[PDB]
Design a protein around this motif. Structure first.
Motif, PDB file in Angstrom:
ATOM      1  N   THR A   1      10.215   2.447   3.946  1.00 49.19           N
ATOM      2  CA  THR A   1      10.318   3.828   3.426  1.00 49.19           C
ATOM      3  C   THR A   1      11.736   4.162   2.967  1.00 49.19           C
ATOM      4  OG1 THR A   1      10.878   5.000   5.437  1.00 49.19           O
ATOM      5  CG2 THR A   1       8.481   4.537   4.980  1.00 49.19           C
ATOM      6  N   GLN A   2      11.776   5.182   2.132  1.00 49.18           N
ATOM      7  CA  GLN A   2      12.938   6.028   1.820  1.00 49.18           C
ATOM      8  C   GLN A   2      12.520   7.454   2.170  1.00 49.18           C
ATOM      9  OE1 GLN A   2      15.667   4.512  -1.408  1.00 49.18           O
ATOM     10  NE2 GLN A   2      13.758   3.575  -2.087  1.00 49.18           N
TER      11      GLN A   2
ATOM     12  N   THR B   1       2.802  15.465   0.543  1.00 47.27           N
ATOM     13  CA  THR B   1       2.513  14.145  -0.048  1.00 47.27           C
ATOM     14  C   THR B   1       1.256  14.244  -0.907  1.00 47.27           C
ATOM     15  OG1 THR B   1       3.422  13.064   1.912  1.00 47.27           O
ATOM     16  CG2 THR B   1       2.018  11.718   0.494  1.00 47.27           C
TER      17      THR B   1
ATOM     18  N   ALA C   1       2.382   7.011  -4.325  1.00 42.96           N
ATOM     19  CA  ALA C   1       2.366   8.299  -3.606  1.00 42.96           C
ATOM     20  C   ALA C   1       3.699   9.003  -3.852  1.00 42.96           C
ATOM     21  CB  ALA C   1       2.147   8.076  -2.142  1.00 42.96           C
TER      22      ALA C   1
ATOM     23  N   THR D   1       6.180  12.158  -2.434  1.00 44.95           N
ATOM     24  CA  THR D   1       6.525  13.158  -1.405  1.00 44.95           C
ATOM     25  C   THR D   1       7.547  14.110  -2.009  1.00 44.95           C
ATOM     26  OG1 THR D   1       8.297  11.912  -0.283  1.00 44.95           O
ATOM     27  CG2 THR D   1       6.051  11.548   0.488  1.00 44.95           C
TER      28      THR D   1
ATOM     29  N   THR E   1       0.848  -1.214   0.000  1.00 45.22           N
ATOM     30  CA  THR E   1       0.000   0.000   0.000  1.00 45.22           C
ATOM     31  C   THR E   1       0.878   1.256   0.000  1.00 45.22           C
ATOM     32  OG1 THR E   1      -1.793  -1.232   0.987  1.00 45.22           O
ATOM     33  CG2 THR E   1      -1.846   1.167   1.249  1.00 45.22           C
ATOM     34  N   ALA E   2       0.861   2.029  -1.090  1.00 46.00           N
ATOM     35  CA  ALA E   2       1.676   3.265  -1.198  1.00 46.00           C
ATOM     36  C   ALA E   2       1.221   4.313  -0.176  1.00 46.00           C
ATOM     37  CB  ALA E   2       1.654   3.824  -2.597  1.00 46.00           C
ATOM     38  N   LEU E   3       2.173   5.062   0.367  1.00 48.55           N
ATOM     39  CA  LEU E   3       1.852   6.093   1.362  1.00 48.55           C
ATOM     40  C   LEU E   3       3.062   7.024   1.517  1.00 48.55           C
ATOM     41  CD1 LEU E   3       1.914   4.378   4.912  1.00 48.55           C
ATOM     42  CD2 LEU E   3       3.596   4.185   3.139  1.00 48.55           C
ATOM     43  N   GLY E   4       2.828   8.179   2.109  1.00 49.75           N
ATOM     44  CA  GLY E   4       3.901   9.120   2.446  1.00 49.75           C
ATOM     45  C   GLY E   4       3.438  10.063   3.508  1.00 49.75           C
TER      46      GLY E   4
ATOM     47  N   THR F   1       6.812   6.365  -4.600  1.00 47.24           N
ATOM     48  CA  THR F   1       6.768   4.913  -4.298  1.00 47.24           C
ATOM     49  C   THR F   1       5.460   4.329  -4.838  1.00 47.24           C
ATOM     50  OG1 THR F   1       8.213   5.184  -2.408  1.00 47.24           O
ATOM     51  CG2 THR F   1       7.002   3.120  -2.534  1.00 47.24           C
TER      52      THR F   1
ATOM     53  N   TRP G   1       8.809  10.931   4.200  1.00 50.70           N
ATOM     54  CA  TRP G   1       8.935   9.470   4.040  1.00 50.70           C
ATOM     55  C   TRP G   1       7.980   9.055   2.917  1.00 50.70           C
ATOM     56  CZ3 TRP G   1       9.271  12.021   8.607  1.00 50.70           C
ATOM     57  CH2 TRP G   1      10.280  11.664   9.502  1.00 50.70           C
ATOM     58  N   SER G   2       8.480   8.327   1.943  1.00 46.14           N
ATOM     59  CA  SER G   2       7.727   7.758   0.798  1.00 46.14           C
ATOM     60  C   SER G   2       7.931   6.260   0.895  1.00 46.14           C
ATOM     61  CB  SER G   2       8.207   8.312  -0.526  1.00 46.14           C
ATOM     62  OG  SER G   2       7.526   7.684  -1.630  1.00 46.14           O
ATOM     63  N   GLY G   3       6.874   5.461   0.839  1.00 42.09           N
ATOM     64  CA  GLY G   3       7.101   4.011   0.891  1.00 42.09           C
ATOM     65  C   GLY G   3       5.826   3.220   0.729  1.00 42.09           C
ATOM     66  N   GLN G   4       5.813   2.008   1.269  1.00 45.85           N
ATOM     67  CA  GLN G   4       4.627   1.129   1.189  1.00 45.85           C
ATOM     68  C   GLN G   4       4.492   0.341   2.489  1.00 45.85           C
ATOM     69  OE1 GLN G   4       4.642  -1.921  -1.891  1.00 45.85           O
ATOM     70  NE2 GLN G   4       6.879  -1.709  -2.118  1.00 45.85           N
TER      71      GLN G   4
END
Ligand SMILES: [C-]#N
Ligand SMILES: [C-]#N
Lengths: 122, 122, 122, 122
Positions: free
Chosen positions: C94-95, D64, D77, D79, C59-62, D99, C80-83
């Motif tokens: 995240t990265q 984001t 997503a 950022t 699930t993509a999120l940031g 991401t 933070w960008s990640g899943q």
């Protein structure tokens, strides 16, 4: 860290990194990716700090693979930037940028970022 | 793009990148940074896609500088990942990672990221 | 993944991320960094894909934290960008980019990049 | 910089960023991407340093977008992390991470990195 760095490393994806560290700061070797549009070995070249801080800091280094060999051309190149850390369980902790050749239209999506941790075993 | 790439390039910060592209995909040369803990020329090596797509895609490439020369040691290495774009106003569009040697405690702040655009003029 | 994401998360540095995921895709909560120029809790906000792929993709999120609260101002923000990956041992991989406010001269060194892995335990 | 930041911005790709900066450090608004798997407006949230350095430094900020609205879901997503720079030609200089939700197999290729520059005209 010439001695520490020179040899065979494995990352968390199961890729293989074989490198010789020169006394002049040179890195030369081959890279085999366990993943992506890759097969067999690819030439790598890079550099490392051959006179690092004595304060227990890691040793800065980086290298490049262009994803063209006799078998395949992925029209891409990865650079790993990181530091070597010595001691009982030596590591190379990297972050990497993978850029593909693209049209100007697709240039905004040219580059992946990730992180690889290399160890002497596994 | 061996001919296209080989020569002198300048980035938006005033830095100077002198490089020879080999027929085998080698990049070799020197880098002079207009900014940061740097003076005079530093060795660079890297790789480029010596057989890119014929669809007007750019040419993937990368290189590394370790920030040690006879004058200074900044205990750090930068890798540039990007693509060469030919034609009237040729460019190398890059993003870069700069990693410093650090203690394990400061490792989370080891790496900068930026973007450099190289041109044949200015 | 509203239920899956909402709650308390811990990264490899010992930082604490407390988040509520809204049905609309909102993320709201607080962040406490175990490292750097930080004390106590900072407001965070972000977004997540409230209708992710049904193929076992993550699930993509940031989200963002600006490093100002009543105690300190570090003139910086991290995204933070990640899943999110569900199942027995749920993770958020995240990265992150950390940008400091800088002068135009120091702008080239404005941004750190790193990676954080968040778990429900430890 | 509440006043400076609030309003409509445009990047080099022709995307539109419409934002309101809160006195508290909040950023809220909508984003329209000229590129990629995107159409119409997407919700954005973020944060900015509401009391930046008085030394001519830029203002740190981030936000984001999750690429789901009523028209499309790109299971991704972005950022943006960067700094606002005031004066006659006001800019927001950013780097970004995109991401995608992926399988564990494709997780190494989950994240794009780029850079957007936002201006008040164009
Ligand atoms: C290419 N996805
Ligand atoms: C600041 N190093």
């Amino acid at each position: 860290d010439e001695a520490g760095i020179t040899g065979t490393w494995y990352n968390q994806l199961g890729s293989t990194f074989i490198v010789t560290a020169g006394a002049d700061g040179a890195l030369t070797g081959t890279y085999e990716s366990a993943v992506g549009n890759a097969e067999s070995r690819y030439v790598l070249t890079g550099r490392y700090d051959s006179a690092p801080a004595t304060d227990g800091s890691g040793t800065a280094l980086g290298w490049t693979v262009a994803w063209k060999n006799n078998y395949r051309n992925a029209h891409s190149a990865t650079t790993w930037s990181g530091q070597y850390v010595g001691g009982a369980e030596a590591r190379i902790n990297t972050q990497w940028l993978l850029t593909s050749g693209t049209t100007e239209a697709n240039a905004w999506a040219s580059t992946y970022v990730g992180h690889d941790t290399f160890t002497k075993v596994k």
